[PDB]
Design goal:
The complex is a heterotetramer, with 2 copies of chain A and 2 copies of chain B.
Chain A lengths: L15 E4 L10 E2 H6 L6 E7 L2 E11 L3 E2 L4 E5 L4 E8 L14 E2 L7 E9 L3 E5 L3 E18 L4 E2 L2 H4 L4
Parallel strand pairs in A: 3-12
Antiparallel strand pairs in A: 3-4, 4-11, 5-8, 5-11, 6-10, 6-11, 7-9, 7-11
Chain B lengths: L4 E6 L6 E5 L2 E5 L3 E6 L2 E6 H13 L6 E3 L4 E5 L3 E6 L4 H5 L4 E6 H15 L69 E4 L9 E3 H5 L12 E3 L2 E11 L3 E3 L4 E5 L3 E8 L5 E8 L2 E5 L3 E18 L4 H7 L10
Antiparallel strand pairs in B: 1-2, 2-3, 3-4, 4-5, 6-7, 6-14, 7-8, 8-9, 12-13, 13-19, 15-18, 15-19, 16-17, 16-19
Helix pairs in contact in B: 1-3
The chains are: A mainly beta, B mainly beta.
Bound molecules: P-nitrophenol (NPO) (2 copies) and fe (iii) ion.
The site of one P-nitrophenol has 11 residues of chain B, from strand 13 and strand 19.
Enzyme class (chain A): oxidoreductase
GO molecular function, one term (chain A): dioxygenase activity
Protein name (chain A): Hydroquinone dioxygenase small subunit
């Protein structure tokens, strides 16, 4: 019987960099489940960065505050069940500087706009987070998720603390 | 930049056609791909060769350096391409024995495609893992033009959006691979309010990857500016050693891979990176890398598609490692 | 300090069906596609077909002469009675960094475990002494064995093939039909007429015929002997499964067809030369290089050896046996 | 009938060679035995391999040779064309060849003293024992190529600068 091995918040197994003639720091090696496990709920920790772009890791637990962005973003559920709520902003420029990049925390209070819909993600499901929408998450049990985004006001960097230095 | 390529004779005994591009010559026999250029020669086992050729063709010369092996490969200049022998080999370079020629891309690509078609025989799929396909050995025997002509799949924004690249199903020709038989196939629950159905969108990405019909083929599934999520399913050995002209990132989504990491310029071994589910690491712009995977596994390759990067890395205005700590 | 003998049969994996093994600080594991090697401080992978083909040779040749590199990383050095197993010893990158590891064994101890690995890892219908077109595949989970293919008796002439009491000529009747890629090779015995009383020293045989009937590839086998001079011809197809770094000069005489030799520096592994040999070409592989051969069609090669145990020291304390 | 096994010949051979990445071609001592024999005088034994005392010698047989003998075994391999080997068991081998010496000795055209041992007819790819204590001679109707497994001696002609690849 074929068994495909997936990670989870409470069940992962880090590999790492084996050295011949290098510095393990060059490979910026971490495990996204570990990063999520040690963070505040909905804290978005950069696990990858290339110029301005980032991949962020986060533990979904309880209900998030609202987010919006001046560009598209994508979220990939990695572990448990995560609910996504989408709201079409009446004046999105009231909450997000159009010149800004990366997600903006726009408050716990309900912003003004129309209901777009609801998404329920399980492990391995990706949803779009469209520019001009506000979004928020609800997870009953802790679950892990990743963001394809740009570094901005919500992006927490802590490389020395999450990466292998061997 | 050169444009001169040529179909040579069908060999009477082997049944295969021989080919020329600039100063380079291509011939295969029962076992081998035989390369010549002004001043030298090289042999690559035909299976290894066809697997690598298949990638360089499917990827449109990809990014940076696609090394077929420790001697032969290509450098993508994006509209133009360099083909080389020993350019990234310390032995050839120290001796001034490396050779390279610069081509217009569609000129080298057209002869690469002709090579791949002529040299691929009945029942051999150079895009598959060895357990999934036949053998390339012997004299010319039919062809496999279907396997080598697969249509490239790229999302403009995200898989499954109206008018974007579609979800994979049994009905559209993509069943689940045998080594992903246990992977959950359900789609995420999507419920849009009236008028918003075009923009409330989600899909099962792991199930999408479970249905990929090829190995080692990064395909764009979601886009944010120049930032590309290019996941793929992998098995056996990456048929090339990739020396990128930018930094790139790997996130292991299932099972595991080891990356054999060598110096881009010299080819000297430098590290081996073992990645299991959830591991994310970066490949520096001064290394080349080649992956190994026992079981068919899911991998996310994350690229920055910006054309400014290579001249920046060259100048030292962009770092060879994206982050230091 | 002495040479080592600690080897062990580790556990049998329940899904793959294969057993893993230990020799000193080295562990040996194979799965569907690969041979996985570990030593203290390091790890390596070799595709299982290449590994088995190379393992086959090291076993059959009793560790051979000097260095038998499986690839750019892993191999053995013969000290004749003792044997060093290594990772990275002949690789400039590992060595410059102090990451090469080597362990010295009693030859009998290392061989016994090599034979166990080779037996367990080789599956039904796969013959690692054959060319790829001649045999099946080694991929996937354990499925039977091919112990007969890996248990072939070495053949060695004491004086010459066909002499009374010496190693016999090959025929269909004694299990040695002509190979498909030598179908056109003439198979007549030479004319031999002995006067009464002299029938034991008037002797001749068809050597090309004898080679055309070899059932293995890349296996130097003694056909005639003069002191330490050994004529070791063999039939070759595909790629020589190892990169041989010799502790002496060895000579190659191409008897039929064509071989290309990839020639690299013995210590670093850097490419130095490529040698093309067609019928009648004779050349010397110096002591300071390693080499690997490529043969499209099954071809006849004479490997000429000087088996004198005094040479490695004399060479260490010329490199090419003819200076000009 | 598609399989063709390519064998060389005095009149039809195609030399290969050494391509250099970073080395000296001389280190490889490269020659073709058919070329060597075609340039030599009849029955002249030109060394084509050397490993300490031991040699491989190449020769062109043409007509009848003088007799030879040796203090040790030797072997002859026919490489192209038909060669006859005549064997004579010497009465007193020490009268013709110094034992404790090595390599073949040319012992003259005149028949040596002893008994008829036998006759061997070799074609391409056939190898014969040249046994210690015997005198041997060759006859070849047309030029034929041959190879000896022996030791450097009195008949061994050395000329590596002329036969091998220097560039
Ligand atoms: O060049 N690369 O880093 C690659 C290429 C293909 C693949 O499937 C994975 C990684
Ligand atoms: O010494 N060698 O590299 C070899 C080993 C085996 C063979 O069949 C020919 C040459
Ligand atoms: Fe890459």
């Amino acid at each position: 019987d074929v068994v495909t091995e997936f990670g989870a918040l409470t069940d992962y197994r880090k590999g790492g960099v084996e050295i011949i003639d290098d510095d393990p720091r060059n490979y910026v090696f971490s495990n996204v489940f570990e990063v999520a496990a040690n963070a505040a709920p909905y804290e978005r920790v950069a696990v990858g960065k290339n110029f301005e772009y980032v991949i962020e890791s986060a533990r979904a637990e309880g209900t998030s505050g609202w987010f919006s962005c001046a560009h598209d973003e994508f979220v990939l559920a990695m572990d448990g069940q995560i609910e996504v709520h989408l709201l079409k902003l009446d004046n999105s420029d009231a909450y997000v500087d159009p010149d800004s990049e990366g997600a903006v925390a726009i408050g716990e209070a309900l912003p003004e706009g129309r209901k777009m819909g609801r998404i329920v993600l399980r492990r391995g499901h990706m949803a779009l987070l469209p520019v001009g929408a506000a979004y928020r998450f609800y997870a009953e049990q802790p679950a892990a998720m990743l963001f394809q985004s740009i570094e901005g006001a919500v992006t927490v960097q802590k490389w020395g603390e999450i990466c292998q230095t061997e | 930049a050169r444009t001169d390529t040529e179909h040579l004779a069908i060999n009477n005994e082997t049944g295969y056609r021989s080919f020329r591009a600039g100063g380079f010559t291509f011939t295969r026999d029962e076992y081998f791909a035989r390369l010549t250029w002004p001043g030298g020669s090289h042999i690559i086992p035909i299976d290894a060769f066809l697997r690598a050729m298949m990638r360089d063709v499917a990827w449109g010369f990809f990014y940076g350096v696609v090394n077929f092996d420790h001697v032969f490969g290509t450098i993508n200049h994006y509209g133009e391409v360099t083909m080389f022998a020993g350019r990234f080999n310390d032995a050839y370079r120290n001796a001034g024995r490396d050779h390279e020629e610069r081509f217009k891309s569609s000129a080298l690509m057209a002869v690469f495609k002709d090579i791949l078609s002529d040299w691929t025989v009945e029942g051999y799929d150079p895009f598959a893992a060895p357990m999934e396909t036949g053998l390339p050995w012997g004299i010319k025997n039919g062809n496999n033009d279907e396997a080598i002509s697969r249509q490239r799949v790229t999302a403009r924004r995200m898989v499954g959006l109206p008018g974007d690249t579609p979800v994979r199903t049994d009905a559209n020709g993509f069943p689940v691979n045998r080594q992903f038989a246990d992977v959950p196939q359900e789609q995420p629950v999507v419920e849009a309010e009236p008028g918003f159905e075009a923009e409330v969108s989600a899909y099962n990405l792991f199930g999408y990857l479970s249905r990929s019909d090829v190995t080692w083929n990064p395909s764009v599934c979601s886009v944010v500016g120049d930032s590309l999520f290019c996941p793929t399913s992998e098995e056996f050995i990456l048929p090339v050693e990739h020396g990128n002209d930018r930094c790139e990132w790997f996130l292991q989504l299932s099972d595991e891979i080891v990356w054999d990491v060598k110096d881009k310029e010299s080819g000297k071994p430098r590290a081996r990176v073992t990645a299991r589910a959830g591991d994310i690491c970066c490949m520096p712009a001064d290394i080349r890398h080649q992956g190994y995977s026992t079981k068919r596994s899911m991998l996310l390759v994350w690229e920055n598609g910006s054309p400014k990067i290579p001249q920046m890395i060259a100048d030292g205005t962009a770092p060879v490692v994206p982050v230091t700590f």
